[PDB]
Design a protein around this ligand. Structure first.
Ligand SMILES: COc1cccc(CO[C@H]2[C@@H](O)[C@@H](CO)O[C@@H](O[C@H]3[C@H](O)[C@@H](NC(=O)c4cccc(OC)c4)[C@H](NC(C)=O)O[C@@H]3CO)[C@@H]2O)c1
Length: 138
């Protein structure tokens, strides 16, 4: 019921206590998913599950500043499975984004972009059927 890629506006940016919830299902034979928290053309937080990087499943996280990718943060805990429904929750905390998948903590990503109130869009893309994308204050 949502079209991918999907853009979710984050009015006034993000702030600590904001909880973003994404519900969807991974397609069969998926190759990738991506969440991109944007500050204009900059990517404050890219969260990128990769289903076949050299026959390994990995989650890659990074920031893009002035069109340049920085230092990648990689996690080999990989909770996604092709064909299966998922829930991604991203909780903004003071020093990091905190990510849980299917109610299990996955990773944290330290704020590199510091102007949280300018991170005003979330792009959701990749090999998913997207069911809902929303936010609340915790
Ligand atoms: C595929 O469709 C897309 C649509 C829209 C946007 C994007 C963006 O993809 C980009 C984004 O995910 C970025 C995050 O760091 O990594 C880019 O890929 C990176 C490799 O991950 C990055 N790969 C690795 O470092 C690597 C590979 C295997 C194991 C390992 O362990 C440390 C590391 C590669 N680095 C080098 C030196 O080639 O440089 C590429 C270009 O910057 C993606 O092209 C892709």
């Amino acid at each position: 019921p949502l079209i991918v890629p999907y853009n979710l506006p984050l009015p006034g940016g993000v702030v600590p206590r904001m909880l973003i919830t994404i519900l969807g299902t991974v397609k069969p034979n998926a190759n990738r998913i991506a969440l991109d928290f944007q500050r204009g053309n900059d990517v404050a937080f890219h969260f990128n599950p990769r289903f076949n990087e050299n026959n390994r499943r990995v989650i890659v996280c990074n920031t893009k500043l002035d069109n340049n990718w920085g230092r990648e943060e990689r996690q080999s805990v990989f909770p996604f499975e092709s064909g299966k429904p998922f829930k991604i929750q991203v909780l903004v905390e003071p020093d990091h984004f905190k990510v849980a998948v299917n109610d299990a903590h996955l990773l944290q990503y330290n704020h590199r972009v510091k102007k949280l109130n300018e991170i005003s869009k979330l792009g959701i893309s990749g090999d998913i059927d997207l069911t809902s994308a929303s936010y609340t204050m915790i």
